[PDB]
Design an enzyme around this catalytic site. Structure first.
Site, PDB file in Angstrom:
ATOM      1  N   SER A  97      20.164  24.551  17.040  1.00  0.00           N
ATOM      2  CA  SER A  97      21.583  24.209  16.857  1.00  0.00           C
ATOM      3  C   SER A  97      22.295  25.339  16.135  1.00  0.00           C
ATOM      4  O   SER A  97      22.603  26.387  16.687  1.00  0.00           O
ATOM      5  CB  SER A  97      21.762  22.907  16.038  1.00  0.00           C
ATOM      6  OG  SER A  97      21.523  21.760  16.814  1.00  0.00           O
ATOM      7  N   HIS A 122      22.978  24.389  21.534  1.00  0.00           N
ATOM      8  CA  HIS A 122      23.687  23.239  22.082  1.00  0.00           C
ATOM      9  C   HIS A 122      25.042  23.067  21.444  1.00  0.00           C
ATOM     10  O   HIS A 122      25.238  23.335  20.279  1.00  0.00           O
ATOM     11  CB  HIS A 122      22.818  21.962  22.030  1.00  0.00           C
ATOM     12  CG  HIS A 122      23.161  21.013  20.930  1.00  0.00           C
ATOM     13  ND1 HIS A 122      23.813  19.816  21.159  1.00  0.00           N
ATOM     14  CD2 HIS A 122      22.960  21.080  19.599  1.00  0.00           C
ATOM     15  CE1 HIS A 122      24.000  19.188  20.015  1.00  0.00           C
ATOM     16  NE2 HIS A 122      23.497  19.936  19.053  1.00  0.00           N
TER      17      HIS A 122
END
Lengths: 199, 184, 186, 197, 201, 178, 196, 197, 197, 197
Positions: A97, A122
C-alpha cells in the site's frame, strides 16, 4: 515479546542496547507495522532526529510493512523528501500500500529490495462505512479522489511512469516481485546475497 | 395456547390470577379482566388468586382502584406467596372474603425505589416517597385494622407471616381447609 | 389449509387430550409460572368433576419452595383425590409433591429416582436483613421436615438427618422409606 | 493518574521520591482506597514496618476511604492496636464503614478530622447474594451476626458508648459531620485550619 | 497500587526497599492472597531461599489469606516441614481453608494469632463443575476423598486431635475466634497488644 | 404448523419420533404420547422411530418405564443414528420388534455426567454414579443378551455398531430391506 | 500517549525530570482529570507534601478539570484551606463542577484564569440510580441536600455572594467566561497574555 | 503478585535478587506453570544456559506443574537428556501429565519427591475440537497415536517398565502418591523432612 | 510498537534519549494524537515548562493531529498565546479540526506546513447524543453556539479573515492543501524540501 | 511468566543478563513463537545486528515454532541467506510450516535436530475467509499460487528434491521425525545426546 538486549565492549566504556537501537545507531529506521498515525509520527520523529544528529550522513529505512493509512503516508513522504540527508530504502519482505510508495520514494539510486521481496500497490481504500448527509459524503468522496490522484502523482514522479498509467495499473491490486518492481521503477536494485560462502 | 386456554376456562368461572411480578403489563391485563367480568355480571363475585412477590406500586394501585370501583365483590386468595403489593392486594379484598391457603406466606414491608439526578430532582423524588409511604401505610392500616404506627414499625423491614399469624394481624379473614372445605 | 388448533400446537394438543383424561404433568423446574398453571389445572379439573381422581405425573428436579407449597395447598384443598406418579425423576419439591399424593395413591415407576434434601436459598443484604432471612430459614426448614415426616411416616429426626445432604432413592428404597405406596410393573 | 516525583538535596546524598513515599518517610500511612484484602495487607505491612524501623515514634494514618471489607477491618485494627507505637488518625474527607471504626480506633487523644470531614457508620453489609443449603446459610448468618456484634463491641470500646446504643444508631446508615463525630466520641479533636492568614 | 518504598541509612551503604522486602529481609513471608498455584510456588521459593540464606534462623510466616487450592496446600506444607529452620506462623486477620492448616502447621510453640483473628476450616471444595465419563469422575472423586482424608490426617497430627473428630467438625464450615483456635490446638498463643501506652496494665 | 401437522398425521398412525437430544421436555412429550396412544388402543402396536444422539439418563428412564408399562407392544426403529439413551431405548423395544434401517449407526457407551461440590457432596454423587452405571449395564445386558462383563468392557469408551454388527450384538432383531 | 522527559545541567549534578515533576518542583500541582477519589488523594498528598517541604512558600494549583465527585471535593478543599501556605489557583481551560469551587477556594487575591477559560457551576448530580428501601433513600436524599447546601455555603464564603443567590444561580448549569467569573467573585484576576 | 526481592552481602560487592533468581544462581530451574510452548522455551533456554555457564555441575529442576502440551514435552525432554550436566528432578507438589514424564526423565538416582507429592499420569488429550476433512483428521489421529506411543516408550525407558503396561495403566488417569511413584519407578527417593527438630 | 532510543557522546558525560525527548530538548513539542483532555494537559505542561526553562527562545510545535475536543483547544490556545516565547507551528501531515486552529494560532511569520500537508476545518461537532430536559438542552445548545462563534472569532483574529466568512466556509467540512491554507492565512509559508539534491 | 536473570563474574566487571540475552551473546537467536509479522521483524533485526557485530562468526538459530505467516517467512529467509555469516539451524522440538522451511534453509552441513524433534510441512493455508469481488479474489488466488510455488521452489533448492515432488508430498500435511527429516534433506545431522553418562 522476546527481543534480547546485549552489551558492547569498548575502551571508552560499556553500553547496553537492542537490535532496534543498534539499528538506529547506524541510522537505520525500521518500518514494520501497519502505518497507523501513531507509528507514522514515530517514523517522522526518527527521521527528523537523525537529520538533526548528523545532516550529511545517509538515513536508511528498512521496510517490511503490510500497509497503511494514506493520511499518514504523505506526512512520512514529505518528511523523507524534506530532510537534508539522502534516504536509502530497503524492502526486506513486503512493502504494501503506503509502504510501497515510500519504498519508491527513496533517493534515486538507493532503493532496494531483497530478492524474494514483494511489493503491492493499490488505490486508497476505506473499509468502515462513513455515514452522513449527501453533502458531507460528496465532500468526502472529493477528498478521496484528491488523495487517490495525489498517490498516483507522487508514484509517477518517482517511478518515471505517467500518472494515467499508474492509475490504470492500480485500479485493482497489483503485486510485484522484486525483479518486477525494479522494471516498474520502484526500486533501483535487487540485493544480491552476501554470504561469505560465496567464492 | 394451552396455558391460556386453561386461564380462559377459569376466567369464565370468574376466577383470575395474579401470579408474578406486578408490572404495568400484568396490572393492565388484570384491570381489564375485572372490567370485563364486572360488565358481564355486576352481581356475582370475582375470585382473585394471588401468588406474587410483589412489584410496582403505581401498577398495583391501578388494580386496587379497579377492585374498589368494581360493582361486585372481590374475594382474595393467598396461595403460596403474597408479598409486598401481593400482600396489599390480598388485604384489599372485600372484607370477609379474604382467604389464605394454610401454607401460604405473607410478606409486608416498606416500598422500594430509586433515586437519581440533580439534587433538585432528588428532593422532589424524596417528597414523593414521603407521600406514597404515608398513603400505603394508611391503607394497610385500614385493611388490617392495625394502627398506622404499628404498620409503619412492622413494615420497616421484611415482616413475614404464616397464614395463622396473618389472620390475627388482619390481612386475611379466613384460612381454608381439608377436601370438604373450611374457614376461620 | 386444514387441521390447525383444536389444541394449538402439537405438544400442547397432546397435553390437552391428556388433561381431559384428568392427567396433568409436572415436568420441569417448579417456578411460580409452572406452579400457577398446575394450580389452575387442578382448580379446573376439580370444578369439572369433584368426585373423580386426578393423576399427577412428576418428572421434575425440584424448584421454588413457595411455588411448590401453592401446588401442595391446592392439592390438599381439592375435593377429589390426587394420585401421584414418579416417572424418571422426583427431586426436592418434586419428591415432596410426589409424597403429598393422596395416601395409597402414590406410585413410582420402577426406574424412577427420588431425591430428598434440605432447602436451598440465598442470603442477601444488611446484617439486620440477613438476621430476618435466617429466622425464616429455620421456620421453613422445620416445617418442610415436619411435612415430609408426616408424608413418609418417618420421624422428623431422621428426615432432618437424611435431608442434610442429597439423599437418593431407588423406587424400591422409596417404597420402604414411605415416599410412595406402590411400584407399578404390571 | 499523574503523580509527580521529585528529588531531595542533602549532604549525605540525593534521593528520588513521591508524595506517598515522602509521606511514608514521615511515618504517615495513607488509607484512601476501598479496604479490600489486598490493600489491607499493604496497610498492615506498612504499620508493621514502621514499628520495626522505629518503635517509639508515632505513626499517623491519613484517612479518606469510602469504606471496606469487615473481614480486613479487624486485621488492620488488631495491627494498629498491637504495634508499640502510638497511632494518630486523621480523617481528611471521608471515613466510611470500616474506615470509620479505624478512625475511631486511633490512640485516644490523637483522633482527628478536618472540619468538613464526614464520618459514616453502618452495620456490615453483604451485597452479592450468597447461595447455598440452609445449613450453610445459617452458619453464614451466624458469622455475620458475630461480625456485627464485634464491630459494635469495638466501636463501643473506643467511643465510650454502650454497645446496645451503637447498635440502635447504626441499624441504618448514620452520617456525622466532624463536629458530630467528636460528640459521638469517634474523634478527639477537629482540626482548625493553620493558614498563615 | 500505592505501596510506598523507602530508604535505609547505614555505614556500609544506602538501600531502597518496600515493606514486603523489608519484611523478607527479616525472614518474614507474607501469605495474603488466595493460595492459587502461582502464589504457592512464590511461597515455596521464598521458604527454600530463606533456608538457603541461613538455615539456623527462624522463618516467620504472616497469614491473612481468604483460602486456597488444596493441591498447592500440601506442597507448601511439605516445604514448611521440610526446611531446616523453624517456622513461626502468625495469623493477622484471617486464615481460611488451606491457610488454616498452614497456620496450624507451624512449629509447635510458635503458632500465633492476633486477638480478633479468625480461623475458618472446611473440607475441600470444588466449585466449577467437572464434566466427564463416569469412569473419569469416579477417579476424580476417589482423589478428592484422598485429599479430604489427608487434610484431616495432617490437621490431626498438628492439633493433637483425632482425625475422625476433625472430619466431624469440618463436615460443614467451622469458624474460630483466636481464643477458640487456641483451644482447638491450631495456634499456641494469642498475641497480646504491645502498645507502649496500654503498658500500664 | 406444517412440521407439527405432519408429526400429528403420523401420530394418529401410532408412529412417534425421538429425533433429538433426550431432555426432560422431549421425554415428557414422548411419555405423554405413549400414554395417549395406549389409552386410544391398548391392543395395537406403537412404532417409535429413533434418530437421537442420546441425552439425559433420568429423562430416558421415564420413557423406558413408560414403554415397559404400556399395555401394547412398542416397536423400535433405528434410523440414521441411535446413540447413548438413543441406543438404550432402541434396544428396549419389545423383543422381536426392534428394527434397524440398514445404514443406521448405533453407539453404546458409559454415562456422562458431572461432579460439583464439597467433598461430602461429591462422595454422594459418586455413590450414585456407581448405582446408575451398574443398573444401566444390567439393562443393556438384559436387552442384548450379552453378559454384563462384556457390556461394561465395551461401554468403557465409544463403541460403534453398524446395523449388521448391532443385529449380532443383540441391540436389534431385524434389519429392514426394500 | 507520549510525555517527554529531559535533563537539567548544574554544578551539583545532573537530574532527569518530566514536565509534571518540574512543575511540581516549582510548587505547582496540576489538577486535570476527573476529581475521582483516587486523584483527590493524589492532590491532597501533593498539597500536604509541599507544605511539609516548605511551609512559607506559595503553592500554585493549575486547573483544567471537567469536574468531579462532591465527596472528594470537600477533602481537597479542607486540605487547601488547612495547609500553612497560600494557595494560588489558576484556571487554564476549564474548571467544572467541583473544580470550580476549588478554583474559587484559592487564597483571596490569588485566583486566576486565562482569558478563554471557562468556569461551569452546577448543583451536585448523581448519575447512576441508587436502589433501596424508602428509609435508606430518604437518608440518601437528606445527605444530598446537606451536600448541596454545603457546596453553596462554601461558594458563598469565597465569592462574597449570598448562599440563597448561589442556589438560585446553580439550580441549572451555569457557565461563565473568565470575565464573568471575575464579576461573580470566583477569580480575582484574568491573566493577560505575556508574549513579546 | 507479591514476590520480594532482597540483597546479598559480600566482600566482592552487593547484589539484588529474587527468590527465582537466587534459585537459578544455584542451578535450580523452577517448573511451575502449565507447560505451554512459551514456558517450554523458557525452560530449554535456562537448561541450555546453565549447561553453558558450567557443564560439569548438576542442574536441578523443581517441579510443581499441573500439566502441559505434549508438543513442548519432548523438546524439554530432549534438552534435559541432551545437556552435559546431570539433571536432578524434584517434585514439590504436583507433577502432572507432561511434568510427570519429565520428573521421571531426570538422571537415574536423582529423581525425588516431597512426601505428600502427587504424580499424575495420563495419555495425551486434546481438548478443543479439531475440525477438518476426514483426510486431514486421519493424519491428525495418526500423529496423536505416534505421540501417545512415544510418551509410553519414553516413560518405559525411564521407569524400567514395559511400554504395553504403561499403556494399560495410563489408559485412564492414574494418580500416584510419592511412595507409589517410587514403586512405579518414576522417582528414586522420597525426600525426608530435614527440620532440625 | 517500537521507538528506538539512543545515546549522545560528549566530554561532560553520556546521555540516553528518544526521538521525542531529543525533540523536546530542541524545544519541539509534538502534537500527534487526538486532542483529548489528557493530551492537552500534556501539551500545556510542556509549553509552560519550556517557557520556564528558557523564556526568550522559540518554542516549535509539530503538528500531525486528526483533530480534537473544542474544550481542550482553547486551553492550549490560551497557553500558546500566553507564554513569553514565540511559537512556531509546523504542520507535518494533517492539522484537523482543533489542530487547524492551533496551527493558525502560531506567532505570525512562523506558521508552516510541508507541501503535501492537509488542513481541515470544521465547526464543532458533537457525536454522542446528549440526553436531557429541554431546559438543560437549550443551555447545552447555547454553550455550543458560544463555542462555535468563539472558534470562528479566534480563527478570524489569526487569518485576517472576517468571522462571518469563516462561518460560511466552515459550515461544512473544508479541506485545504498547504498552498490553499497559505492563501487562506492559516500558515505563512510552505516549507520547501531541503535535500542536498 | 517467570524467567530468571542472573549475574556473570569476570575481572573486567560484573554484568546482569537473562537466558535469552546470554543466548544472544553467543550468537543464538531463539525462534519460538508463531511467525507473525512482529516477531519476524524481531528475528531479522537480530540477524542483521549479529552480522553487523561480527560478520565472520556463525549465527545459530534455535527453532521451536508451531508455525507462521508465509508473508513473513520469505523475509526471514532472504535475510538468513543474505547475511555474511553462516547460519546454523537447530530444531529443538518442533519446526512447523514456515519454521520447517527456515530449518531447511540453514547453511548446508549445519542443519540439525534433537532426536525427538518433529518437522511438519504443509502448503500455505488461509484461515479467515477473504471476502470480495471475483476480480479481487482471482488476484488473491493468483498470489496464493505464486506463494505456494515459491515455498516449494525454495524447499526444493535446500533439500535437493524436485519441486514437483515437494508439491505432491505437501499437498496434505506431512510430518517428519528427525531421522525422516534428515532423509528428506531438511537437516544434515541428528544431534546425539552429549550427557557425561
Amino acid at each position: 515479546y522476546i527481543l534480547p538486549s546485549f552489551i558492547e565492549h569498548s575502551s571508552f566504556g560499556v553500553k547496553e542496547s537492542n537490535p532496534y537501537n543498534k539499528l538506529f545507531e547506524e541510522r537505520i529506521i525500521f518500518l514494520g507495522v501497519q502505518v497507523d498515525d501513531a507509528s507514522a509520527n514515530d517514523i517522522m520523529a526518527q527521521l527528523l532526529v537523525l537529520e538533526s544528529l548528523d545532516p550529511d550522513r545517509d538515513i536508511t529505512m528498512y521496510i517490511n510493512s503490510p500497509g497503511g493509512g494514506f493520511t499518514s503516508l504523505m506526512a512520512i513522504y514529505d518528511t523523507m523528501q524534506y530532510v537534508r540527508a539522502d534516504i536509502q530504502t530497503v524492502c526486506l519482505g513486503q512493502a504494501a500500500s503506503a509502504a510501497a510508495v515510500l519504498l519508491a520514494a527513496g533517493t534515486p539510486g538507493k532503493r532496494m529490495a531483497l530478492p524474494n521481496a514483494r511489493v503491492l500497490i493499490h488505490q486508497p481504500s476505506l473499509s468502515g462505512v462513513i455515514q452522513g448527509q449527501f453533502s458531507d459524503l460528496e465532500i468526502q468522496a472529493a477528498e478521496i479522489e484528491r488523495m487517490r490522484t495525489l498517490m498516483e502523482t507522487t508514484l509517477a514522479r518517482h517511478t518515471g511512469k505517467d500518472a494515467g498509467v499508474i492509475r490504470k495499473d492500480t485500479d485493482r491490486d497489483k503485486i510485484l516481485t522484486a525483479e518486477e518492481a525494479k522494471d516498474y521503477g520502484i526500486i533501483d536494485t535487487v540485493l544480491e546475497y552476501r554470504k561469505l560462502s560465496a567464492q | 395456547s394451552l396455558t391460556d386456554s386453561v386461564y380462559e376456562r377459569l376466567l369464565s368461572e370468574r376466577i383470575i390470577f395474579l401470579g408474578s411480578e406486578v408490572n404495568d403489563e400484568i396490572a393492565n391485563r388484570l384491570c381489564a379482566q375485572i372490567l370485563l367480568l364486572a360488565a358481564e355480571d355486576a352481581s356475582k363475585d370475582i375470585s382473585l388468586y394471588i401468588n406474587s412477590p410483589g412489584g410496582s406500586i403505581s401498577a398495583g394501585m391501578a388494580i386496587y382502584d379497579t377492585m374498589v370501583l368494581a360493582p361486585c365483590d372481590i374475594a382474595t386468595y393467598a396461595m403460596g406467596m403474597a408479598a409486598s403489593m401481593g400482600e396489599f392486594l390480598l388485604a384489599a379484598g372485600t372484607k370477609g372474603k379474604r382467604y389464605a391457603l394454610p401454607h401460604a406466606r405473607i410478606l409486608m414491608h416498606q416500598p422500594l425505589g430509586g433515586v437519581t439526578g440533580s439534587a433538585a430532582d432528588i428532593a422532589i423524588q424524596a417528597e414523593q416517597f414521603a407521600v406514597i409511604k404515608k398513603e400505603m401505610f394508611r391503607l394497610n392500616a385500614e385493611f388490617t385494622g392495625q394502627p398506622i404506627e404499628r404498620i409503619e414499625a412492622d413494615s420497616d423491614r421484611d415482616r413475614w407471616f404464616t397464614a395463622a399469624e396473618a389472620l390475627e394481624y388482619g390481612f386475611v379473614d379466613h384460612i381454608i381447609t381439608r377436601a370438604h372445605v373450611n374457614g376461620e
